[PDB]
Design a protein around this ligand. Structure first.
Ligand code: HEM
Ligand code: CTE
Ligand code: CYN
Length: 347
């Protein structure tokens, strides 16, 4: 529950986070490092509830990212963090780092909102994932119910429509980023806050909107187990254990099964094609077409951001890919649309 985590301040950092944008602007690394040290001596994380540990991962993660932004590995500089992070990670059963979950839906709205910088463009990122994630999560549950209904059942069409509506929340979220986040300001002022951090011998990437569980919708809906050695499966493979635990079984099951659309392609070309069946297959095109309404403007925005004019120090996103990856996911998604349009063409 997002609001039950967003309202917590387990490490009493509310005042500190009002100062953090200024601390970051003036490069006050000592104050950052003093705060990490104060936390490891002030708090016994083992006594935390789950929601407390999730909110503490949010707050501690963002301070660690500010230190890493300067170029210092924060756990190397504050070595007692490692034990602290290990204890939090056992309670959350999540990585010892913040993700888009902690930064968006679990990040409080209004005066307490945790932010790296004073730049209003940063709001574009936060609101983007804060809007996308709950809607994608609702679409995931509806799309998983589709495998067991008939294309001729009107409940199928109704569920698929409900999920297209819920996926639109991701469209609205990337639209908010496009309005609020200048590509140049992103590459020069925000991107450096999302770099990898070394914790207990492993490197954990920084938060990314690619951590919204849209890839989980893909796997269930069209990717399934049909593209084993693809670059997209390798990114999903790398993402499964960044997800909150409750989404991991859905994703793993889906990676090892035929997708909904491959199955409904088989059923369609094998059953009495009625008027409901065509409506049912048309509701899947509708979901796919909402994904395109997300991925097309998204591709454009990553292209402007990584252009020679607007990029700064980076040629890649926080997960380490170029816009070539985005293009590859978009082509995949366009191919699905073309395939469904063929199955429907004689109707
Ligand atoms: C200035 C803003 C943004 C830029 C420059 C950007 C760029 C990128 C890049 C470079 C990747 C490749 C993965 C990586 O290397 O990190 C990626 C993938 C992805 N990004 Fe963004 N992005 C931005 C905003 C957003 C927002 C606000 C969201 C969600 C609300 C989002 C959702 C995704 C998703 C879901 C993927 C996985 C690929 C896909 O599903 O098509 N991005 N993006
Ligand atoms: N990964 C992308 C943009 C990005 C980084 N962090 C984000 C967050 Cl926390 C939300 C939305 C987008 C982004 C890039 O590094 O170019
Ligand atoms: C993309 N974040």
């Amino acid at each position: 529950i997002s609001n039950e985590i967003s309202k917590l301040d387990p490490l009493n950092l509310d005042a500190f986070f009002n100062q953090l944008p200024s601390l970051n602007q003036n490069l006050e690394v000592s104050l950052l490092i003093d705060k990490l040290r104060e936390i490891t001596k002030s708090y016994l994380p083992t006594t935390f509830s789950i929601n407390d540990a999730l909110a503490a991962t949010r707050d501690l993660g963002m301070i660690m990212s500010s230190v890493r932004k300067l170029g210092i590995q924060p756990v190397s500089a504050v070595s007692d963090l490692e034990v602290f992070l290990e204890t939090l990670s056992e309670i959350t059963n999540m990585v010892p780092r913040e993700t888009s979950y902690h930064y968006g839906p679990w990040n409080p709205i209004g005066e307490r909102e945790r932010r790296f910088t004073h730049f209003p463009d940063e709001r574009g990122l936060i609101e983007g994932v804060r809007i996308a994630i709950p809607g994608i999560e609702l679409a995931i549950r509806e799309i998983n119910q589709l495998s067991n209904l008939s294309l001729n059942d009107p409940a199928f069409e109704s569920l698929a429509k409900s999920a297209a509506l819920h996926v639109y929340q991701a469209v609205d979220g990337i639209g908010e980023t496009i309005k609020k986040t200048d590509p140049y300001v992103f590459s020069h002022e925000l991107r450096p806050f999302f770099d990898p951090i070394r914790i207990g011998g492993k490197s954990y990437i920084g938060a990314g909107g690619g951590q919204i569980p849209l890839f989980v919708v893909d796997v269930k809906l069209w990717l399934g187990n049909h593209s084993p050695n693809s670059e997209y499966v390798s990114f999903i493979k790398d993402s499964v254990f960044y997800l909150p635990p409750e989404l991991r079984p859905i994703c793993v099951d889906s990676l090892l099964e035929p997708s909904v659309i491959n199955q409904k392609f088989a059923e369609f070309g094998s059953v009495e094609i009625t008027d409901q069946v065509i409506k049912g297959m048309e509701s899947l095109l509708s979901v796919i077409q909402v994904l395109l309404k997300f991925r097309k403007p998204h591709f454009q925005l990553a292209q402007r951001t990584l252009s020679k004019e607007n990029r700064g120090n980076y040629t890649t996103g926080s997960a380490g890919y170029t816009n070539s990856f985005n293009h590859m996911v978009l082509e995949f998604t366009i191919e699905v649309e073309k395939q469904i349009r063929a199955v429907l063409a004689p109707y």
